[PDB]
Symmetry: C3
Subunit: 211 residues, 3 copies
């Protein structure tokens, strides 16, 4: 059985910062696929990086498989959102007669769930805004503030986020998105690792005898 | 008078991070209005977020009332601004003969006070540069670097700062600025609170027309 | 006359501002005299050098009399992954994947980070791999240096933007021809009132009688 145990929190026995995210999950509304890792700074858990995530709001954080999440990467959820109709001041938090002004969930600018695809490389100290969707194979530069959606297999970075370039031609991206090697069994992946790594997409298609 | 005590440092039960700024001010030249709060990370003091702030400079940091100041927000004052006529190296700091090369403040590029208005929402990890004016009701996006003045009731963000959009119409902004609910008595603030929150500016305008 | 460049803590009472050169213990880090690091809480400069691995052999070079603000980070080439297909570092987890380690040809290595002399680097700046920064250049705070920085130019932001040139083209050439940082400390101490007040025309007179 080539490969590490995806349920083993600390796969690299010399390393104590790099953690497989999935088996560390405790909270709800957080779904992280197998083999996705978080390379922490001082050993902090991935969930500590998830901020403003209140069960009451119901927003979710979805991360696909085989994702590289750099140290300091922050996920800002909808809890950070202030009401923008009149004053942005959350009077209700202080109570003492102001709890009657408790906002409804429909009074708040809810941006939705954060969805991160598979095989995603997220640079160091990246901050991710609420409602952001990130496509498979996407690359996010370090120190980037992801203020919008990121296309599959695209390189982006900066504050606010800027589109740098697309990794492969539009046709090639289609083939990767049609293949979805991350959803295959580990037996198949291990037998296809060379072509996945060197990006020989036209060999993977021969490897998978389709109809 | 309903509402929390503005003198109360930690006004929320079971919260050790969100603080009322004004009653924490120990240092000078930091003028912060009532109800303006700082939601700290590890419970750190607001003043610790104020950098390069030396008293003799008379450099002032002004913040209005009812401001939301996110965690990690730092305020860069003039202070340690190196000379830019030649070498930016601060020789005088190391002394041992170099102390005579202390820059005259006439030779220093002072930008002036940091002035932040009322009802301002500043996101997490924002950096604010010297001499920056921020108008009432503005919104600073998270991780932003304020390198320029921010117009009242506008949304800004980025590094360097970019203008995103205006919060409301020009006419509606004028109505808020003519209102100045933060400058009204707490009695009548509570009396207008349901409208201040849902943004019923038309009602607020009517209430103030009545108050003449 | 002046401070001792071999003194780790040049200022009495200051436990944060360090001379970088006498603190260096690791390899491939070359820092000139009088260049200092004004740390947040006393941390060593080397700790601000990230993804610096011996197996790559990339170097960090910094001239003399550089001001480096707190939180400044230097990102080296050990960060980037293979980008031909999957950016997932399989080889790290081993257990049958160690064979999939990428060669140097497979990696998008950007080279060495070279910073000149008399360079002012603001607080919380991040330096990307392969970046060259000219002499006298000023790096604004919070900036992410994603490209080369011309000598005596002011830059900042993420990604890096060009703000302005400090002096005219002629004056810049004159500073670059002067190189006061290469003069003997006896000569520098005689010219400090001119190095600081920027009066370079008087320096050209003085260098003429020196040459
Ligand atoms: Cl919760
Ligand atoms: Cl959604
Ligand atoms: Cl764009
Ligand atoms: Cl190959
Ligand atoms: Cl300037
Ligand atoms: Cl703009
Ligand atoms: Cl009153
Ligand atoms: Cl190493
Ligand atoms: Cl091996
Ligand atoms: Cl010498
Ligand atoms: Cl002078
Ligand atoms: Mg930018």
């Amino acid at each position: 059985g080539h490969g590490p145990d995806p349920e083993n929190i600390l796969p690299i026995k010399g390393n104590r910062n790099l953690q497989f995210i999935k088996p560390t999950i405790t909270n709800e509304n957080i779904l992280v696929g197998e083999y996705s890792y978080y390379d922490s700074k001082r050993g902090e858990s991935f969930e500590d990086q998830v901020l403003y995530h209140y069960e009451v709001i119901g927003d979710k954080l979805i991360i696909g498989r085989f994702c590289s999440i750099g140290p300091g990467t922050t996920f800002i959820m909808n809890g950070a959102n202030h009401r923008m109709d009149g004053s942005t001041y959350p009077f209700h938090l202080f109570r003492m007669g102001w709890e009657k002004y408790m906002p409804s969930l429909k009074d708040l600018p809810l941006k939705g769930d954060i969805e991160i695809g598979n095989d995603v490389w997220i640079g160091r100290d990246v901050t991710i805004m609420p409602g952001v969707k990130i496509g498979d194979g996407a690359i996010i530069a370090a120190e980037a503030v992801v203020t919008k959606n990121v296309a599959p297999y695209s390189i982006v970075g900066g504050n606010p986020l800027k589109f740098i370039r697309k990794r492969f031609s539009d046709g090639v991206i289609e083939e990767w998105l049609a293949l979805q090697w991350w959803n295959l069994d580990m037996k198949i992946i291990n037998e296809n690792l060379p072509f996945i790594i060197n990006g020989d997409i036209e060999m993977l298609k021969r490897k998978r005898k389709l109809l």
